[model samples]
Target chain A: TVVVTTILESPYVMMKKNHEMLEGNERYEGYCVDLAAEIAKHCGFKYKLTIVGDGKYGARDADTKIWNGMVGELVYGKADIAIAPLTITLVREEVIDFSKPFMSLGISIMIKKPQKSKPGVFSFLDPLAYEIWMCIVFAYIGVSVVLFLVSRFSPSLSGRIVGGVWWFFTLIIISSYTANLAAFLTVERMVSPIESAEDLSKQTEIAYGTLDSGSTKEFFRRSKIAVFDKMWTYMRSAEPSVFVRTTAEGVARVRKSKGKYAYLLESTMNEYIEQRKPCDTMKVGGNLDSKGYGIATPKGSSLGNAVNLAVLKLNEQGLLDKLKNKWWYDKGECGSGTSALSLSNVAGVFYILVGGLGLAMLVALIEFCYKSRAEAKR
Target chain B: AFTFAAFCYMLSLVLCAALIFFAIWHIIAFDELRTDARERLRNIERICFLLRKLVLPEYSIHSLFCIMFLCAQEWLTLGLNVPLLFYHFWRYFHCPADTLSYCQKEAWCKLAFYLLSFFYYLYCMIYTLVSS
Candidate 1:
């Protein structure tokens, strides 16, 4: 028998009024609660359900290398299995083994309706922008002039330049510059409702909450983006219960409050906001990025194989579909749960290739110019 | 005449210096060991030594200088029409295995480097001919 460690995340896992009254696994109930039962039935194991000691789940503490919360429970052997909205990231994968994703979700932005005003244009041109532009403009002009000078004297120089390098750099620089400019113009034309994460990071004007203990905070902590750190600090400053509290409370705060409080619950919870009557509030600005949720187990445990098979079974048997229906993720399927393909991976590869080719051509041009000048001197 | 080469060489030297500085900075800033506790400083030192021995020899000062110079040209080309010639030169030498070889392997490394350099030189000559 395994001790299933979980948290009181709504619709997924929750404590019943009589939960304490019942003993062992019988005490707990929820979608995951039922799902766990089904998984155990399939795996042929009798398991006990226990809530994590505290709601604080998966975050890296500097003092302790171990991630706290459900991650902690698994790492420390306090729990043998975890069936929760646990995210799978590279860092967590190192410490805990996760089965194939039972569900996919991601961290997303929630904001109080911004006062109808646009932010400055220069705000978008952060350091990354400047550096990218500098590389583009410098490489383009530098390569062009060197080629022009070489071609002016040495008529034979043209045939050796790689067509591949020329095409790659030209396309990259032109497309990147044009796209960035267009995006800037578009944002300028429309007032940015959410200027930066820092603006809404705090519960000061907006009450924001992510899952009590999850990868969202770690995402904030590890982010290389400057604004993300500011947002992290702002988010961390709030009361811990800001995230741990009920989804109903979160939505209620957003709907009834002075439009200052915003909650950062799971995307699944956000879907339910529409079903609740007087549903004026909407999930704005799409998902922050793509991520997946998986069944977690202690690292190197044999249970991973069983859980992986169980998830595959669930997916094939349409049980996963039933869970989504039970949770109401399908309702906001159009509004909030839209999936956009990330082109960043493709763009990164393109950049490396272009940069490499551009550098190669430039070196060739320099050598040609040196040889020509030497011949002229002789 | 000597002054021209000296100046080009000096500028190249500076560029090389900057690359080393930035490379070291990148290594240090993004290093896995940065999060280690103060008590683990000795261990970190050992690890750093090991890593330096493993990765640093591949990018010697001379090759790195050439890369830095080429990179500088790429930077300059932002506003100019400098023909692209040797884009892949720096990347090839940056490989750890290529840099670490000695004796028989060293000849192969040098041959590869020169072959790439020759191709780059040829590309420049061709670009010059076409643009002219």
Candidate 2:
């Protein structure tokens, strides 16, 4: 019988409530518990579950060179197997074998959900970006120059046809842009000056940092990648040192810091917290690096092959995906994308459409009057 | 004028589609080109050896150094350990039971240090120049 080692990570492993009322494995329940049962049933084995003595995911100490947490439990032979959200890292893989990743993840930043900006008097300009406005301005000038040259050279059918078509297309594009701007003035948008890690590192207004001790911290410290290295330097010397000791502490700081502080953490945990109640925290920017969590076993254990096969079969059958949805999404709280809409949000667009048609008609009238006068003189 | 504008829009689509095809083709051909280069090298190695066997004294040994330098290129350029790949480069050759009597194996092995450092500095210089 295998002594399954696990940790107390939420959704992965949690103690069964009222232990006196339940016995053995029935006394606990979580994603890992359910998974372990599936694994043992497929491999045809009986196993007992045990939690790690320490509450760490696992890291090797520099001084003693001893592994700690669930990893230590496995290395020291305290548990025959470990099945939790233990990450597959190069350092950990040195002393242990892992099943193929059951879950893939990466490091990301978390910040309080940005508040919607209040509608302003000139918010109509918000619809089109400044660069976009400039691009259209350039497009208009070029079209005008071409139309002028063609019309001057020939009072022929081609010149008229070309001018009509060019103006028609230009009208469609600008009218759309103008309406879009009005719509923007009506609606509130969540905008951030910081959209990416480059943005984060380039500015100092929103101080950012990561967990004090974890793979994410090590990634920045040891990475030769220039951007990450720069962030590491910034994090290392930032006043009061932005690193938090625990994920809980990091999440707490993010909650309390208003928008001044951003927390860097694993995308999985960041996403999980983003879905939790109060819904003020959100994942910011893409992940810094990609990795996975795999079921760990002792080096060269017989169960390693069976566990790997079970995971692959399950993955092919779409079982892991279903399980993730069942755990994270099915039980998910907090709603997204339900921004309240009213006619005021779109009143500006209607105004622009009306104004544009009138301008077009007036321009047509002037052209007709000019051509009629020219004909009478002839 | 509107008709001309509509034609311009159609032309834009064709131009964009052409660029997209080129990018995808480039992505596919990159790996193919590298693999083709490797296959050609492997195919010609025996003929390269025979040129030495027919007329050149110890030309095969000279070929060995050339291959070693090629293998070392990545290691030295990336600032990776040299001997780790050097061990693999030596192992890649078929076992020579009869032809290793050149008496300079030990001396040649000793010369690896100079060769590795020379290649390493050369890579650094080239990289610096290109980047600048």
Candidate 3:
């Protein structure tokens, strides 16, 4: 008999309707639970489904690079296979080989449908419209003409004023303006009621939660733009949970509180929501990034080939699709999709831009000071 | 001296323009909304400030050594087909020297100089590849 490590995630793996009637691990039921049974039949092995010992699937250790979870179980030889919505990341890829992605998903936002309003340049831009654009263009042309005239006539004064002070201010205005404009443009393009991750970062006064120690925490930590870190910092300040204790509690918070709180969760959970009656809550945004779930096995264990091959067979037979459809892997669609720019890369670019401008400002200020000293001496 | 300073200012203006363009491109390509942009800007500001304060300094034994080393190397590589690129290195250290020192104080100057110098060299190397 094989020990298959699992987690207590609903729809993926949870207590069945008739759970009490079943014996041992048979009491549990989920998409993976069903999938595992089918695989066992094909592979000709009886398996016991047990939840991971520690709830945390995997986390970065400050000292050790190794991860802990069902992945850990396989690495340490505790479990022969893991059938959870386990994401396949580069770090995890090193320790265990995942089958062809059994399920594909990334971090996505969920919201009530019929998005309120489209994103505009500025919240005020919608009202001003053509007038603002006309003023902006006119101002640019006027500034250029003044610079040209000053440079052409008064050589010495022009050298001092047009080439120096005017030029300095131009740089400052242009740098700041361009930075602001680009930000405005991005918001305009990605129209969503959810302005940013920060807006949704804080747990509403109602309730919210994520799968304990799942990728959601890492997702929040890895964010370069989102206030995920700030939100987490704030959340930790409290006694933990006020309205809800688990991710399900937080998700339920959205419905129970009339969208006061939002929950961060895997697509699998979203799918589960659709399969059930009343699919009121819908996933609004496109996935932030791509990740997948796979069957995990002990490192260097010979079961790797068998399990991987079994997954492929399941996929080819269309069993995987059927299982996904049954579990509602894709359902309850709503809200705006992700923007062209990813938050991390955006942060990197902003860093380089701000650094370069700062260096320029330093040079310009030094020049200004030098000119002042030269005039004083004269 | 003022003319030389003015030339430096001009050079910096050009650098700023290029940097801003790159930055805007990054923002457009990476950030999707106002909140994302704000968070990114804040992080960048913090990083740049930290780098300037703790890793670059104006007056220091190490900076002095770098200056002397740079001048000597410029002379040595002056006749070479490919310039040593020491001038670019010198500009980086010299441009922010006063501010770095003011922010960090003289005692920590060496450490700051070394750290900034390392980052500067790395940036220059990457810049050369992209430009070429």
- The candidate maximizing TM-score is 2
Query: Is 1 or 2 the stronger prediction by DockQ?
Result: 1
DockQ scores for all the models shown? 0.01, 0.01, 0.02
List candidate 2 segments past 4 Å from native: A16-20, A118-182, A185-187, A336-378, B1-132
So what's the TM-score on candidate 3? Answer: 0.42
Docking class of 3: incorrect
List residue ranges in candidate 1 displaced over 4 A. Answer: A64-67, A109-253, A256-265, A273-280, A329-378, B1-132
Give TM-scores of chain A for all candidates: 0.52, 0.71, 0.54
Cα misplacement distance, residue B45 of candidate 2 (Å): 99
Candidate 3 scores a C-alpha RMSD against the true structure in Å of: 23.2
Chain B TM-score list for all models:
0.28, 0.25, 0.25
The TM-scores, one per candidate, come to 0.40, 0.55, 0.42
- lDDT tens digits, residues B10-64, model 1? 4333333433443454345334554636658866676556544433333343443
Worst 10 residues of 3 chain B by lDDT: B1-10
- Interface RMSD for every prediction, one decimal? 17.2, 26.6, 20.0
| Residue-level lDDT tens digits of model 3 in A1-378 | 988888887677878678778778768876898889888887788788888877867655779866677877877778878888777777777877776677778776554433334342234334334434444443444345445434422235544664576578668756766677577656544243454454555435533455556567666656656466666655556555532446656666667755445566676666566455455666655566677788766557766787788888988899888877655644323222225633543454466679989999999999999999999997
lDDT of 2 by residue, A106-183 (tens): 888889888765444445556665545444544554455445434432236766786788789789877987787556
